[PDB]
Design a protein around this nucleic acid. Structure first.
Lengths: 63, 93, 17, 46, 17
RNA sequence: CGAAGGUGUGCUGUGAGGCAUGCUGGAGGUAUCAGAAGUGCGAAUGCUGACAUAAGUAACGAUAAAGCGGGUGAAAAGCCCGCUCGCCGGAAGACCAAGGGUUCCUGUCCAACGUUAAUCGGGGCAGGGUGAGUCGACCCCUAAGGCGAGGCCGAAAGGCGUAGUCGAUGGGAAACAGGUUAAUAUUCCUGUACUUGGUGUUACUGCGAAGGGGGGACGGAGAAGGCUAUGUUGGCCGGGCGACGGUUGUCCCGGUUUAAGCGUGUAGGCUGGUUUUCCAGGCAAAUCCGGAAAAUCAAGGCUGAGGCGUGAUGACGAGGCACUACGGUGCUGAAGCAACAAAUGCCCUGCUUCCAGGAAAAGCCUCUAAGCAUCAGGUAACAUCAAAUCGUACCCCAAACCGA
RNA sequence: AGGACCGAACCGACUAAUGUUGAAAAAUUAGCGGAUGACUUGUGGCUGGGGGUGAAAGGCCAAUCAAACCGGGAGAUAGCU
RNA sequence: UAAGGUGAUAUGAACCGUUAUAACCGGCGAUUUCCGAAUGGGGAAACCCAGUGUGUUUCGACACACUAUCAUUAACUGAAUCCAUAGGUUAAUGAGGCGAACCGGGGGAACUGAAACAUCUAAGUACCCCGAGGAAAAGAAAUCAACCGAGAUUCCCCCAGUAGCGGCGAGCGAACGGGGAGCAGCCCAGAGCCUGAAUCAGUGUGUGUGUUAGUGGAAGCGUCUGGAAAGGCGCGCGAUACAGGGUGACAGCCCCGUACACAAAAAUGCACAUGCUGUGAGCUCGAUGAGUAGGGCGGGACACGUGGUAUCCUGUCUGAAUA
């Protein structure tokens, strides 16, 4: 899942990055710590999505 | 502006223990895991933004990791910091 | 939560657990 | 009686610390020999 | 199984001169 | 349908050896002739691992000392609780500094350690525990000393050293009483305060230093006065009159604590002040220091423990009452005064003498040049903001630091 | 005032005893000398090997000193066992 | 390449994909905390404290880049004296350190041998410092030879334990010449004619070729022992593939492999053609390296130790000619 955001603009990409860092990351880690989390792949996939979005931002903005 | 994402990242997990429960029920304060640096101002801002509550003051401390042995291999636990954030009279969590 | 730590096979003079 | 070794972290660091070794080339050569021998503890440090 | 590193110096011999 | 190794046997050769096989083993070995040895062990006070010897012997690690009862447990002298006996008590008590890095508390086990057992531990596994604007580190300055831009010198390396920068063993701003957990507290909670700077308002004003002046800022020895921490007695509060004689009495038992900050500033110590005029001195100037003359009063000014009121009709408080996972928790809570003695601790970096002549800079008050003075900046009052980061467990004259 | 006197902490080890495969690779008990000065101690540095320091004994220089320790010449050489 | 995977100790739970964006490898990029030449200052290393300029939710406070040293060049300022210099400020390129050995140079021993030991040897070895490289140095005779002749340097074997040096003791030890590896000659010290004129250095295109991922790749069964057969016996096939590893005992035909044939979107090492920039062909003349050669004084290397002692260098004093 990369092409659906490869063509997005900087502002919307940053908004998506902020949304991903706020939701599904802080709540996910809190749930995992509290033990209410049942599936652990959520953290891995959200972290990989964050890394992918950061890479796209680095590639687009600047260079 | 990376202040928002820094505030998101500074907080790692909450802390649960008998002392934590006693402080929560008595002093209306919550103890939770924080980043290794986790400066007081950043912790206060992150708590304010995420928990949408009012905090009186934050005092932190660094916990030294214990030395444990798996098999015969010595293995020091990773160090971590905990912050005792004191909430206002109005508490949510 | 990760309860299982998978303690390895110990030496012959190992704690009885 | 008092033995030869009386520990003192500050004195140890200022006498045999990494900065003390690197101040002069001889200590730098000692560090190079340590690296070549591949010792995990390159020098005295906390 | 290390060999004894330090061995005390022998007791001085009795004067046989 | 059993190679090598191991293990006994019968033959065989003057011999180093050779042949076959009983059993283990489990998958490699190798006829004859040639080629090279890291080619043959019984010693070298030989090297590595193991096992005997002494020998089930010394010893079981200051002659401060254990007993009984109950409890858990399979097992109790050493593990938990109660009553007795003993030791330190200028320590064998409590804090720390340096030094260790979780040994601190709980649950859980006796695999290994404790010079014995152990249910126990500073032992094995799991969990919890270290909260700072007022503690210290951090940070400003600096002594001894280190580094050292340029610079000098030296075959190279490198040695010395200026400006500068480090370097606490020192100098700089601020918090105290009570309570709390199984483990944190001068950090958390209750009460009362304080210190340094940013921001904005109000009224004034000239501001401004790597520069100048004072301060910081100091040795030895010795005695007195005020005191305080501290301890003794008396009165007061609550309880007791008591198993071997008497004990309502001038008798016995426990308490009679209250900080920092705020105002007065005392005992004591230091010094003569107010004003005017002038000076190539303070590597430039100076209202600041120093010096030179005047009129005036004779006191002023600085430092200064302690005590006193507030802090505080607040906390604490002997003891009693009600429930106890029977370890313990909740409520209540009277008096909280006088005198004496007194320190090595404060006045005291004090005072008097002595030669052995007794650190430096920074913060701090003040002065102005450069520049600006409708600004900027400073002063006095108010409101708010921030004071970050690091250690806070535990041992710290010892079972935890240096001695294996 | 005393490089004063007696005597605690502190410093050192003059005598005796025990301990020599000891509690300790110089220790413990009682005596013993100084204990206001040439005293001692905590902390931080300076003096580095034919050199340092030395109230000077050939003493100390990390339990080793008439020339420390570490690595190299180096498997120095040994007419010796 | 791909239908199995989220690395191992060391299983699990939760998942992705299964015809392609599951997983893995490769080429090119991005991120790359702190200490570490650390490079803003300091410092006991993974730590503390700053200034400048760029933009921002409560002034609060934040994110980014720079601020080390030296060398060279350039610009602006700038004293003791006018000029001027030294110095000061700013801009640009390079180095600073690490790394096993090889090279050259500046230093540089001792033990031991001579049956002792000082000349000597050990030895220009042990070891320190400096500089660059993939090799470095050297290198085209002010050389030899002998009056016959060879034409750069380096390395291998003879000459050769020869001649020689040597308390003529121990020991050290050549050269000429011969056979081989490989051979490239030039540039400055200067004028005129002709002036891209060959050979090089710096960048693109094309062709060739190798790497960084890889693909295909032949051929055996039945019977007996036997835990298991690749082993006993029978009959077969491949081989430009029985070189190797694993498979319940020794497998050519069980799998990975090997012989053999191919693959490259992208970056690459090397051989040529084709492009662009810089130094730069050939002809006539002259010039042809002065504080040098040499000598005196004391030494070092040449096998050669001062001996009858040539040659080169060196600390000091002198010192010509130039064809």
């Amino acid at each position: 899942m990369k092409a659906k955001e490869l063509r997005e603009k900087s502002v919307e990409e940053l908004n998506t990055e902020l949304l991903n860092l706020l939701r599904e990351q802080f709540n996910l880690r809190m749930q995992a710590a509290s033990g209410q989390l049942q599936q652990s792949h959520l953290l891995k996939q959200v972290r990989r999505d964050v890394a992918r979005v950061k890479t796209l931002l680095n590639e687009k903005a600047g260079a | 502006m990376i202040r928002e994402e820094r505030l998101l990242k500074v907080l790692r997990a909450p802390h649960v223990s008998e002392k934590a429960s006693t402080a929560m029920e008595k002093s209306n304060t919550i103890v939770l895991k924080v980043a290794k640096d986790a400066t007081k101002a950043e912790i206060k801002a992150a708590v304010q933004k995420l928990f949408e509550v009012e905090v009186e003051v934050v005092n932190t401390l660094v916990v030294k990791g214990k030395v444990k042995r798996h098999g015969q291999r010595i293995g020091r636990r990773s160090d971590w910091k905990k912050a005792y954030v004191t909430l206002k009279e109005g508490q949510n969590l | 939560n990760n309860r299982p730590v998978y303690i390895p096979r110990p030496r012959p003079p190992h704690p009885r657990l | 009686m008092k033995r030869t070794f009386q520990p003192s972290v500050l004195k140890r660091n200022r006498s045999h610390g990494f900065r003390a070794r690197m101040a002069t080339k001889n200590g730098r050569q000692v560090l190079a020999r340590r690296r070549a021998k591949g010792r995990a503890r390159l020098t005295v440090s906390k």
